[PDB]
Amino acid sequence: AQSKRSLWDFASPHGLHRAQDYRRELDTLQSLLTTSQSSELQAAAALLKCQQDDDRLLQIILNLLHKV
Amino acid sequence: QSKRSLWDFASPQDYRRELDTLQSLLTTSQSSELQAAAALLKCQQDDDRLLQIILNLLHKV
Amino acid sequence: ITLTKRQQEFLLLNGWLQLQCGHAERACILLDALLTLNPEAGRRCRLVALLNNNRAEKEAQWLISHDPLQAGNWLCLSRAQQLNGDLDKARHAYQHYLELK
Amino acid sequence: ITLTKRQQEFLLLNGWLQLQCGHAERACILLDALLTLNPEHLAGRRCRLVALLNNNQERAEKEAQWLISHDPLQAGNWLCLSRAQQLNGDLDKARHAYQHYLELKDHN
Amino acid sequence: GRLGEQEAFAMTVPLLIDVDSSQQEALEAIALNDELVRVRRALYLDLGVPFPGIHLRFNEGMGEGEYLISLQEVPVARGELKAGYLLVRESVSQLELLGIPYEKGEHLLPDQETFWVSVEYEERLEKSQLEFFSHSQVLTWHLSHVLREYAEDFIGIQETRYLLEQMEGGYGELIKEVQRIVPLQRMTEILQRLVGEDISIRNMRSILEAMVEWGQKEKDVVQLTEYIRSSLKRYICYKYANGNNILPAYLFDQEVEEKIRSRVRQTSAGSYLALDPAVTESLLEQVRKTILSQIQSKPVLIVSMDIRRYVRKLIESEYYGLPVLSYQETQQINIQPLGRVCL
Amino acid sequence: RLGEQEAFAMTVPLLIDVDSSQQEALEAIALNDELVRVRRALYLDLGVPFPGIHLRFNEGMGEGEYLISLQEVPVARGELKAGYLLVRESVSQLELLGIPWVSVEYEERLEKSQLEFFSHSQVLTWHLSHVLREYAEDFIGIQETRYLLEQMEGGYGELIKEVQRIVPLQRMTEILQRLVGEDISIRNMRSILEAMVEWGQKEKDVVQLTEYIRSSLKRYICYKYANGNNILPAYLFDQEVEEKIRSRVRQTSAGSYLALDPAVTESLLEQVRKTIGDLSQIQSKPVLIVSMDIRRYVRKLIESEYYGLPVLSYQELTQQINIQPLGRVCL
């Protein structure tokens, strides 16, 4: 109850506009981590590529529909 | 009280999960009573599989 | 073979429903499995199942001579003996149940 | 191979979002990468502790020890330990840690 | 009243709450008659459904702690819990409760984990700030749950007509236009479908404007109600996007959407989605593999509009929580793809 | 007393919830007159009949949290760090590093430097004005259009009676909403109604009719988008791009949306971005000028990125205008 909410509030950080900043940081991080040789950074890079292309698919779907 | 007192004397969604565990437990069995119980459980397990098929076919949206 | 009360309750409820829905054979087999596994509620259910199926007296003797905490143990015996052909002793058992009430 | 503060903030936000969407393991992977690159900030560790608690993993005790040995001024550091100890079976120690957290919250 | 009177007909009460006796005057201390109207009014403000009057009765035929809530003289929520005698309950009991384990016990299933503690432990347990549902709180919680899950039965033709007549002074021409465009039956069915998705009726102006705009173009109830849902873009966005621009998504693959759309079956109204039991089982298995209740942001499924409802009833059986949204339903939203439902 | 049915109440159209710690401290500032003043100014600029504004002081929130909600749904949630003392600056730049939200002690010396000084009322009304301008389409309903028509009955009776018999209320309201969506003022209702009468008998599609009504406001558009002396900056489109866009008009039963191919729109948007060039460094409000039949189709193509840059039709341009082409969008 209260303890679970306190856990989530403790984990919580938060003011960033995101939007364009999200896609720009995604592309920079994916190209930074692609060069890496560590395993943890390899898993992180694959996760970022996954989100980068699921987002590319949703941008394509929004572009494809449009209701003037 | 009549027969109601008799019924009172006899008286006391994880259902499918317990069903599947019990059916696989009793399948290993060898005694006659447990064999009859396992066959009864398989019977009900497949009448339920038929009703799941009926529920899937029956939709209204 | 070993189990816990979790599955035993599933078996108990299924046996009770089958007995209350005139099958009694399915309840008898399920309760036979229950008693063969856990011999320690199910005894009363299988007693009533044998009464409605028609052997019942032998099972009723266990409950009467080892679980004297229930007054219902003298109705089932009566029914069992009325299946066996002892009406006067069944009346005596009914009087015993009335005395224990 | 260092990260920009912008990039560290992106990783923090993504980890928080993954925690906020139940994918505890995905948040753990993101925050583990962030800490392996920049270990300086403990907010990523702070949230990955709760992520590991929700992930059902002794590792939580180690992370709580890090937080207690580097930021012992937050009473929240005593809930995770409690959870870890109640997850690891040491219920009595969890009771003691919870009482300590209550005392520190009363202090705060 | 004699043996010549025909029947003395009487209509069934819409909503009834029958609680046990020995709490007629032992209870009612706190409100018992103001808390109920408060929670009903709050739920209406959250939803907009014109909930009916609440009939409260004390029956001594039952036991000591059994309360039942019945809709139209049919019991819909029973429970043998008047907090025992005074044992208040805990709603989020878990191993967290074993952290400070006061005496506890289980009972009938009202919803989530529930255990009961005595009033002497109440002080030290509230020092731990856990949730404390009293008799009034648990009764009103059950009432609110019943109203939320059965609100479709509170929207009839009479209720919609009352709503329209109450707004005649405000927007007369709008009401006359929506009346001339669509009938009462379609409007009430649309409102019921909207409430079935936890979409609030409260903002009736935009609903009527969307009804006017799209009622001349579409006659199918499903498409019209999907358009009306898409007319509430910002409301849906604020209701689900808890943070600034955070919208959790479980987006569907194009192949899966095409497979779902392949069996719309618009034969005799209804528009039931029957593909094949094996196919729906496989799709549900894929969704389960991709997609737990240990979440806090309430993630939402986002799929193509034309099949949105068809998808919802597909996952309502298991994932009653997870909502389903249409792409048409606003901008400036950061949709976060948690995972593609592959085929 | 559990006998009332529901006590129905309609949702408030516009609500502003501010903290309780400025209920009477922010009173002498005349925020209740500033709000009506800015609303009246916005109406005079646009003509949209904005609703009444309800102002309430809620103590649940703290600090200077203010929220503006349309129909009990928040559309602008701002936090005023300016609550205590910190007056703000809107054109803060690197130049502010040379002479450095600011306190009221710096206000005198900064106004000696003559910068933009938004007080609490000014920032609140700025946010309100932005909300009203970007959400004016939600303030034009059937009831509002009927009120506008009834208000002009004494002035132009026969004109209203004819335009009502020519086009219905729904189409007229949709046309007004589309006009306002491009920041075109409704205020000059006479010419709009005359264009509605003239072109409503010929065209039934909403897009074409509203394009004709836009073209009926040539001089208004010219004055609004050309502050100079008949000089209008333009980013005219090539014939090839216009033909490619027009090739996928897709005029269906409900909506003439131009979904062509995502890659094609991506390439066209890249070409537009390469052409237009800078965004913030550009002044004098350049406008895009394209063929009328696709004007809206072009606008919705660039509304995602270039919300600023307006889109105009060749028909919307009157004569005696020196159109200066800043660059052709090549293919």
Numbering used by the authors:
A (entry chain CB): 51 to 63, 68 to 122
B (entry chain DB): 52 to 63, 74 to 122
C (entry chain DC): 3 to 42, 45 to 58, 62 to 108
D (entry chain CC): 3 to 59, 61 to 111
E (entry chain CA): 359 to 649, 652 to 689, 691 to 704
F (entry chain BA): 360 to 459, 474 to 704
Relevant lines from the article:
Several gram-negative bacteria employ type III secretion systems (T3SS) to inject effector proteins into eukaryotic host cells directly from the bacterial cytoplasm. The export gate SctV (YscV in Yersinia) binds substrate:chaperone complexes such as YscX:YscY, which are essential for formation of a functional T3SS. Here, we present structures of the YscX:YscY complex alone and bound to nonameric YscV. YscX binds its chaperone YscY at two distinct sites, resembling the heterotrimeric complex of the T3SS needle subunit with its chaperone and co-chaperone.
The assembly crystallized readily and conditions were identical regardless of which YscX construct (YscXfull-length, YscX32, or YscX50) was used. Diffraction measurement of the ternary complex containing YscVC, YscX32, and His6-YscY gave data to a resolution of 4.1 Å (Supplementray Table 1). Instead, 18 binary complexes were placed manually into helical density present outside of the nonameric YscV rings. Each YscX:YscY complex binds to the SD2-SD4 cleft of an individual YscVC protomer. Except for a salt bridge formed between D108 of YscX and R701 of YscVC directly at the entry point for the helix, the interaction is largely hydrophobic with most residues involved being highly conserved. Our structure of the ternary complex YscVC:YscX32:YscY exhibits the same open conformation showing that no major domain rearrangements are necessary to accommodate YscXY.
